[PDB]
Amino acid sequence: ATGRPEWIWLALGTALMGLGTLYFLVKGMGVSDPDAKKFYAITTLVPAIAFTMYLSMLLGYGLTMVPFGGEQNPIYWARYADWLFTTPLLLLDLALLVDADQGTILALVGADGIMIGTGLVGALTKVYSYRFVWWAISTAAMLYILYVLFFGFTSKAESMRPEVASTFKVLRNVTVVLWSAYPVVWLIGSEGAGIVPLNIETLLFMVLDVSAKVGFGLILLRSRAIFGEAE
Numbered sequence: 001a002t003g004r005p006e007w008i009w010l011a012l013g014t015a016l017m018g019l020g021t022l023y024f025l026v027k028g029m030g031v032s033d034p035d036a037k038k039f040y041a042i043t044t045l046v047p048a049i050a051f052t053m054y055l056s057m058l059l060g061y062g063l064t065m066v067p068f069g070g071e072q073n074p075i076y077w078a079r080y081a082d083w084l085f086t087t088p089l090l091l092l093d094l095a096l097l098v099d100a101d102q103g104t105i106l107a108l109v110g111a112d113g114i115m116i117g118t119g120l121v122g123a124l125t126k127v128y129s130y131r132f133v134w135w136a137i138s139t140a141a142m143l144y145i146l147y148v149l150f151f152g153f154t155s156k157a158e159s160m161r162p163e164v165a166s167t168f169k170v171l172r173n174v175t176v177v178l179w180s181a182y183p184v185v186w187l188i189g190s191e192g193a194g195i196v197p198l199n200i201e202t203l204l205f206m207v208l209d210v211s212a213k214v215g216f217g218l219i220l221l222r223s224r225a226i227f228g229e230a231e
């Protein structure tokens with residue numbers, strides 16, 4: 001375990017996702033409003049899944065070796081198992097906040113599945129040049145998601161309760177900045193061109209993951225937007 005220099009960031013990531021899960025679980029105890037219950041359930045599940053997949057990486061289960069470029073390269077495949085389930089949940093929190101129509105939700109979740117699934121194929125591909133073909137397809141799926149969040153969701157939020165509009169705008173901006181960083185880290189890190197070493201890459205994804213999951217949830221669950229309007 002300690003024989004891998006990145007273990008300290010995996011240990012810190014496990015601890016922070018675990019503590020985040022417990023805080024949201026205790027906070028949501030006794031919430032009775034049905035609309036608020038939905039946001040607490042979605043938002044508490046996100047760090048609980050990431051906790052399990054950080055632990056699997058720390059203990060060494062979620063790592064495999066992929067030959068390319070005449071080397072055996074360590075690839076943490078557990079990240080994609082986490083993101084397959086947690087990235088659609090985070091998009092569902094945003095879509096429920098703006099009362100998105102069912103067709104737009106399906107479009108978003110399906111494009112997200114394509115983004116993560118092609119990321120995994122690129123991560124496990126043994127022909128070096130083809131890894132970047134899958135990266136480009138996955139990045140095109142991400143750009144579709146960001147387009148909808150700006151030119152679909154913003155338009156509808158603006159016609160809703162003012163607290164819904166202001167909380168959506170903030171969460172939208174957090175999401176666009178943080179999600180856009182992931183394809184860059186992958187391209188310069190050990191899965192791509194190999195310029196940044198694996199221990200620094202693991203630090204960068206841990207800062208991004210905690211911010212995009214526990215930071216995002218702290219903003220959302222402190223807002224009055226998740227409660228129905230009631231006397």
Ligand SMILES: CCCCCCCC/C=C/CCCCCCCC(=O)OC[C@H](O)CO
Pocket residue numbers: 200203204207
């Ligand atoms: C909100 C409060 C928390 C704030 C925390 C945010 C920091 C995020 C981490 C960033 C990158 C820093 C990576 C550390 C730099 C190591 C690079 C290096 O030193 O490599 C040298 C090499 O030996 C010769 O080139």
Ligand SMILES: CCCCCCCC/C=C\CCCCCCCC(=O)OC[C@H](O)CO
Pocket residue numbers: 017018019021022024025028031036037038040041042044045048051
């Ligand atoms: C050190 C601590 C480690 C971290 C803990 C280990 C995580 C794995 C265990 C359990 C799943 C617990 C339940 C996860 C689902 C929570 C959903 C929820 O909060 O629902 C609220 C809603 O209001 C209800 O109707």
Ligand SMILES: CCCCCCCC/C=C\CCCCCCCC(=O)OC[C@H](O)CO
Pocket residue numbers: 049052064081085
């Ligand atoms: C609303 C939807 C909520 C969805 C909640 C789902 C949470 C699932 C969490 C965790 C375990 C993931 C386990 C992944 C198992 C992969 C095992 C495997 O195939 O390993 C192959 C081989 O043995 C070695 O490489």
Ligand SMILES: CCCCCCCC/C=C\CCCCCCCC(=O)OC[C@H](O)CO
Pocket residue numbers: 084085088089092100101102105106109113
């Ligand atoms: C493996 C990747 C896929 C599984 C990962 C799990 C992610 C979340 C699940 C589903 C999105 C499907 C559409 C769900 C949108 C329904 C929300 C809605 O429109 O409202 C309906 C409600 O009945 C009004 O009262």
Ligand SMILES: CCCCCCCC/C=C\CCCCCCCC(=O)OC[C@H](O)CO
Pocket residue numbers: 139180183184193195
């Ligand atoms: C809209 C927000 C999301 C946008 C996300 C898409 C961004 C794509 C950016 C850049 C490609 C730059 C490629 C630079 C890679 C060259 C690396 C190389 O081979 O150089 C060797 C190294 O520099 C010797 O030390």
Ligand SMILES: *C/C=C(C)/C=C/C=C(C)/C=C/C1=C(C)CCCC1(C)C
Pocket residue numbers: 083086087090115116119120135138139142179180182183186209212213
């Ligand atoms: C909880 C973790 C989050 C919000 C992770 C988000 C991950 C992405 C937006 C990843 C995107 C990628 C690409 C667009 C292309 C290359 C590979 C990926 C999967 C890193």
